[PDB]
Amino acid sequence: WAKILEKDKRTQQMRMQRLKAKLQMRRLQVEPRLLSKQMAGCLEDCTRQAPESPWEEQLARLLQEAPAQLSGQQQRLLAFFKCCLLTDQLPLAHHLLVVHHGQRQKRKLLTLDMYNAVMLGWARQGAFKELVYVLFMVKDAGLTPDLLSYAAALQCMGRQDQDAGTIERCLEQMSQEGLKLQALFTAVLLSEEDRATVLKAVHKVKPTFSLPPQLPPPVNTSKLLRDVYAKDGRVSYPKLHLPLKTLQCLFEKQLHMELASRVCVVSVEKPTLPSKEVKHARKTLKTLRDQWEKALCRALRETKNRLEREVYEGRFSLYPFLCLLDEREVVRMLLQVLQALPAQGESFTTLARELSARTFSRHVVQRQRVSGQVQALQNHYRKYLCLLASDAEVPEPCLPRQYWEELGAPEALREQPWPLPVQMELGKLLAEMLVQATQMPCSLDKPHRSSRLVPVLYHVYSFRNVQQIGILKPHPAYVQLLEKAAEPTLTFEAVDVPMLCPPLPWTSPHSGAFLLSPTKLMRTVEGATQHQELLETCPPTALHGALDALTQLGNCAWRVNGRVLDLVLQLFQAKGCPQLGVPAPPSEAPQAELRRELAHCQKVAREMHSLRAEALYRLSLAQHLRDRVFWLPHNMDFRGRTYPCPPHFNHLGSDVARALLEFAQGRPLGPHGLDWLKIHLVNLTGLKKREPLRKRLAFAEEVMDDILDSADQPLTGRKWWMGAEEPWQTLACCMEVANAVRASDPAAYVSHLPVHQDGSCNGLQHYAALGRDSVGAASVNLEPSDVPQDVYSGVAAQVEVFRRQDAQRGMRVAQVLEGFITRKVVKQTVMTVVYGVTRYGGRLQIEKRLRELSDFPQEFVWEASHYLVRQVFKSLQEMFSGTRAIQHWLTESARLISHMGSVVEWVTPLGVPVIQPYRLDSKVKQIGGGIQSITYTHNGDISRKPNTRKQKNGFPPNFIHSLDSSHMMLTALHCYRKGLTFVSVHDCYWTHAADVSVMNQVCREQFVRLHSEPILQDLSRFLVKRFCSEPQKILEASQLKETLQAVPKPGAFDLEQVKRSTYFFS
Template sequence: MSALRWTRGAAGLGRALSSSGRRRPTSEEGTLSGLCSSRRSSAASPREQDAQKEWGHAELLEVLEARVRQLQAESRSKVKGKKVQMDRPAKGRSSRWSQKLEAEKEMKRKRQEFLDMQQKQTYTLHTEPRIWSRKDLADCLQPSKKGAARSSEEEEQRLARALQAALPKLGSCTPASAKAVVVEPNTLFLQQKFLAFFECCACTSNMALAHHVLITQHSKCDKQPLLTLDMYNTVMLGWARQGAFKELVYVFVMLKDAGLSPDLCSYAAALQCMGRRDQDVHIIRRCLKEMVEAGFQPQQLFTDLDLAGDERAALLRAVRKAEPAFSLPPQAPDPVNTSTLLKEIYAKKGPKSYPKLHLPLETLRDLFDEQLRVELSPYVCIPSVEKAPVMTKEVTEARKTLKTLREQWERELLRVLQQTKATTACQAHEGQPTLYPFLCLLSEEEFVSMLMQVLQVLPAQGEPLLHLAHDLGLRVLNRHMVKQKQVTNHVQKLGQQYSEYLRLLASDTQVETPCLPREYWESLGPLEAPLQQPWSLAVLLHLGKQLAELLVQAVQMPRSLATPQGSSRLIPVLYHVYSFRSYRQIGILKPHPAFTQLLETAAEPTLIFETTEVPMLCPPLPWTSPHAGAYLLSSTKLMRAMEGTTQHQHLLKRCAPAQLHGALDALTQLGNCAWRVNGRLLDLVLQIFRDKGCTHLGVPPPRSEAPRPAQQQLPPGSSPLQKAELRKELARCLKAAREMHSLRIESLYRLSLAQHLRNRVFWLPHNMDFRGRTYPCPPYFNHLGSDLARALLEFAEGRPLGPQGLDWLKIHLVNMTGLRKCDSLSMRLAFADEIMEEILDSADNPLTGRKWWMEADEPWQTLACCMEVARAVRSPDPTAYVSHLPIHQDGSCNGLQHYAALGRDSAGAASVNLTPSDLPQDVYREVAAQVEEFRQEDAKEGLRVAQVLKGFITRKVVKQTVMTVVYGVTRYGGRLQIEKRLREISDFPQEFVWEASHYLVRLVFKSLQEMFSSTRAIQHWLTESANLISHAGWPVEWVTPLGIPIIQPYHREAKIQVKGGIQSLTFTSSVDISQKPNTLKQKNGFPPNFIHSLDSSHMMLTALYCYRRGLTFVSVHDCFWTHAADIPVMNEVCREQFVRLHSQPILEDLAKFLEKRFCSASSTRSLKPSERVLVAKLQETLRSLPETGTFDLQQVMRSTYFFS
């Protein structure tokens, strides 16, 4: 795992305090609810709603007046500091600083007066639309003449005429979906901002404000193109939930006036509203008739839309009122996955031995309750494993000062937040989509608590405002989504269904028919959860930047903390500064050094994590769809991607449900593996961690151990060359210190989590990337980490070793040392017996003995295995010893294995152990030998660099390049890899590194081309296909053998700017589907991504078939783990599934899919002539598949070292 930045994630060295601010003023709720109300909408009766409707004017005024009274009554608290006598400026001398201070005070006073004046103003919320066309519609909506009262019946008739006049003309408009227009990035941002604004208004019962802003923007000719059908639908749906028919009709009329055509969601909103109001049957029939004429059937309302229970009921009432004989469409039969590769997995018959957890039902239910409490909390506090400081007077005073400051900051943050809400509410009433509804999604206390948490984790060197804003926006979104589930009774229903689901997993219960977790969960019935569309990256940044500015504005401390002689005047804790990163100038929020020093002195013993950054305390929810699975309440994407990437979600949504069953079930199986911490190993690591660490063992030392320059400054008269050398030395030491600090914090997080979970059972939910490769969701403590991270983890459920388990333990130990890679398994086993004395000494005296384990390639995993072997051999019966240690089986250069199988390349297959052999074949050693032959030839001809490299071409020098060339590494990247290896050789003349790396990378590529000719042919075919596809204007797509749809998210960069505030944020996005594809990345990425999709398919197949046979199975990509006793079974399944996978016509199927997707008449209809030429060439390329060899795949079944 790469080193984590100190600033990212959820942890910090401070305690987050709960806020103590006052509750904000509440208001009564009507159809047009108050602007400060955060409650959800209610389905009040029409008469109650009509009685309550005053369009929010009085209510808004009441709220703003209450805010003014609060500000007037609130006294600003200050931290008491020691007064220091300050010298006054000399008479007759002007103090520019005092003048500046007075000017700032005057500006602040005027600004407050302006805000107070704004708050006292009364704003008018527009309700009736301003129509730009269709006079007949405008006449229908014309209000009565002044003084003429209109009865409720007349009002209903007027609205009915308006709707009936609108419906036929709406059907004649151009459908919005037909407007395939490329949207400019900043226009797209504005549209995303509008849509998110309307959605938040609906969530916070601010429909009056949403309606007002929609009308205001609709009435502006230059703004109408920004309003999309989704925006009108969102507002209509919000009114429909409240049964507000008049307002819905107004939005319907505006939709038509904008030249848009309603979709199924539009009709559903209208019918739902009618169902809630018991609307006249003639209007309902008219609406249904127009819907059918537009191409939608009533049955689609209940099959094609995601509806909540009350929405579905209201819709059904309306439809049945118009058509009493209407019946809901029959429930579709359970979809069945028809993939040949998964036929046995989903077969109803056949032997099944699905494993169960080792815990009883009641224990699992208690664990569920505990995990639920964790996810309902905004964060998790965990004790730090850093060595506790001595509680001196200085430490005590620092903690006391921090406590006092935090109490002040919470009050001030609450005040500034309330002021910002009032300001943004006023701006929203001018018709602008402000952040007001976003600031109503959570309580004010929750916002304050969140900001206080973020303040504690800011690094001393500062955090880029862009990163901080993104983090804050994402936190708000995640907490909002959890709260939505709380207010919809989802949590209670989840508890009931999960309790029943545990009967499938618990050790002391049985179900009638054994089945997969997903199948059992679905059999318990649908669990409705409120669907929340994720906000775009630009919206997240806009909200996050506003919250970051609140921190800058509100958080201050006495000047006396910064300078001993300072006054009690308050100074900012955070400063906004600019710094250069590479060639870019970026804005940074940097804490005051005095505040950083205060935190370091206090050394508070707590770390703070987001709930999704901590392993789960109960089994994860089974994955049942792209948006349902993993954590209980926290939303997790099935397919992880960069923020703002949407194409993956669209592809998954279009998939037939059964098509994804293989991936869903494999991810569920991986997440259901229960883990525990290796406590004895953790104690050793903590001992080293607290004692200045050990770089050799992967335990980073503290920053105090960072290298320092021999001298901080040069004597007077030093030469420019000496000064330049000192600057280089200082830069090198600074870089080393920052890297050490980053690694130290990464280890601190991991070890603190391990200590927190000691003696606990926990689970790691999984998801996948866009290629199908799987990853655990918790980022800091998982089995995909370093040697140390893997060694700390054990299976929570143990298995007896059985007759062969001890042998596999010993072989695994030798594999971890890296000493006998070219030996047979029997030779490795004999070697383990030879060094048994060293193994036992390492287990008994790891830090005081001969320390043999420290010289291994993977020292911590070697030590963990030494301890397991020692316990096993000393047990009365080793075959009965219950082992918890995961045993690994690694693929032999797995990417080349897939290429060799695709091309049926006999020579390549032999090099990567696809064929049986007495000894393992080492492709890296073979490449090194081939390169050495080339070098000798060049040296004989007098090539200087070839002569210099004599004796330096080793397996280690070429390994990384050989391993990654199959995944698309270029010659440039390969040269850098070789250069790094050469610099690690102390005897190699460093002046030849650059020339030698260029020379060697050319020979490595030449060797691979000769050894794996079919591999290069397939790579070239994939690259050429991707090149033609992307030049024609499409990103490359394909479907894996398991049915996972894949699209490469490489597009040309688009710049988007979030303006205003302390700094305008400009970010570039390469995942915007409205931009043209990045041809270079598309063609270079296709071969490695395609191979990754194949290795993930092989892993998933192995996981599913191992699960069917009762095995515990996890993986780290092409490294498969299980219990020692089950290694023979896993090896058998692994080979079977590789043969079955590559027995499919993979390249033929890929070519057919690409031709159908990109060369069909429907795909090429809108292309330019030049692009049609490219498509014709693509079709020719796709039909010219690379030639294949004669390798027999069945040989893999007999290959001992295929995975070993």
């Protein structure tokens, strides 16, 4: 059969020759096809000039010739092109660009930015032919070369090490084109290496070319902050109590913890006896986890293979975003997410959002690790720690941000967030893969008795009124298996655990807080970006006060109280105590007429389980940090209030969380510390609210026996402390007081306990300060007096007087309730007056208490609610009139501004700009897919109309919140210079037991200084200049100016008396 074999070989040879012929005429296109005939001829001629076709002269000729809101598809394409650079897949992006430029319909989406991105990507490799191709593209599309195009050309020429003639021609071309070389080096897109290479290319022919000289940053010169930054004076900045080596070791530990991105803690639940069933359950769990890992890896590989082909055919896909991270990291993240799921399920949209937020953080951290910022950060931090260490001396005492800048600040590698559609698409894809790839046996008790496999995650619908909501729910057998196994460990994300080293100083809206992980300066929804734009557009020295205050707040070193933790654990593990704040175990529970009992009993056990699991995380963290020192960074919301970043364990929780925290650095009690400790104890009890400090101290001294007994035997003694308003903090205060008293020298004992100083109705205090009304001011402790003044008691007394007068006149409902008017009835309404309450919202608040009232007849509730609401509001009118005028003025201004089609904005006295992010979402956004059509809201659509209903409701309270945040910031900044430890909760200030006098003095001084400036007139002038100054519209502007220019008049009150007020802060 030699002839047959010869014939087959011949046929194969002609076949491969035919294939070669049809190929030489699924590859990736490299030469664009151009609509213009003469440009196509020019490209053909440039190719045909020589086999070694020089492209440099043609590039010079192409450059020298030089003849509002993006769509969803455009944004996605731009993100694809940008990501193809970090991913290091350039042929893919180039082919997609050539294909889009080919077709008539697709070429209209492209914009100069995509061309620039691909040009820069090609230039980074020192290539010329592809750069010339993209130059042909940008010329044929009818666009113009820009700064970035010339930067790419210069970088390519410098990298390829060409002769100086072409560089001379290019540079002179930019000069004639009106282009500035110095302006080139300010482009954000260029990295350090690109700028260095461009500089080398420039220096080749202009050796005497230098960057602009560096200058020391300016200091803040504002009226309020000129005292903080004054260089003439005495400053004693506090130092930590630890040496340098310990701090460096802690920094290394925190860096390792953040690079790992996971921290595991030991569970605090009652350990279980290792029965046979527990071991069997653990074996089954381990086998299932391994199988899921392998299946997920296979599914991810198949998905990447599928997604690449779509780009290979000219469609946009998500291939680079999947290529960003390693396979093992993605699989581990998916497994952790599946493990953390609750038994009741999670919404589909929420899961899709969460699965895309964790992918970005790991990408950012790994990018930082690979690029080489970790070593620079290590060097800078180890040099900067000399300022806070006790056994180190900095040549000149500086603020932390000032020192961090003076040491030479390394440039921050800013990372671009993905657009919202890309994030949602990626999250949905990952969630679908996780749902599909996980399987478990149907019958766990006996393998192969029933061999069929069933899914682990199910996709059910949940109905609320008319609306459907897609919900993923775990299989019940898996939930029961997890509960039976009783795993002994918990897993926490590295951003949900307090830092083990002092946080990075805030030096810019981009850098600060955690060492590597990203953190928003202004916490808000994912897509919103107007706040960041306003922050960045401001002069650099405006935000120094806010950044310095945030850094000062984040540098407090905490530690965990021991004995309180032991007692709480003893109560928690055995039986619990709902009357104290410790949830009961699930074992202890109550356990068509039978339907009613079953419906109620199942209702009770839900929140009982919810509370127990919520407190399991907090108490497991504290045990893990029981012999360590930890820090809590801070950030702001869009008004200015500051919150800590770690949510699970911080001093903003309930009394159980506030009793486990104390300052790490202690101070001697001094000569006036024991009295403040006792007064704080009495304040915590809540028995003597309306009494002077002398009577509080006397009462504290008269019940010393109970305090001593509660400090000695807390759970087996008289148990006096349990009657307090806060049972748990009171125990800690009792222990501290007993320890201090028993000591040989009570004036030298070191105390680690914070002491609070609250403010009574701070919103109304700010309102009265703005309005300068004597009657209102005198009732919120803005005037000197001997006893505290309670506004709630005064309002209740006035209402009772009105009721007595009406009953004397004669009325059934009035005489129905006699003696039923008290502080408890009207406290909620008076408290909520600041938030714009009305005569309708107060009815439902008064009726809630009236229903719980027993002796009151239940047939008069409606009339009583009406009468009480009317009387309370009438009495409130007499006490506060300036407040009403201010509220009406602000509401009208906000409404008139919103009707013109613009969202309100203002500036706080410190300098932070504020803006209200209320808009109407009319058009709906969906994502069609394999499982469901997720509906999301496009935040960051600046074309939507303002929501007038939500902008006239939220303006008056946000102004007051910004004002109180400014007051707190000023107080913290001025307290730091005296060497005090300061931590604040919105309007409660904490400090050591020996510095309360100094803190009170600084509080009063800063309040007077802040409110002496003309706040209202400044706000009115800003509003007039920003909005009304328009020539295009005259009638709307006229109405707006008429409203704005009429500022309510001030009263007759003297602000200096606040400095002599004993109970302004009590």
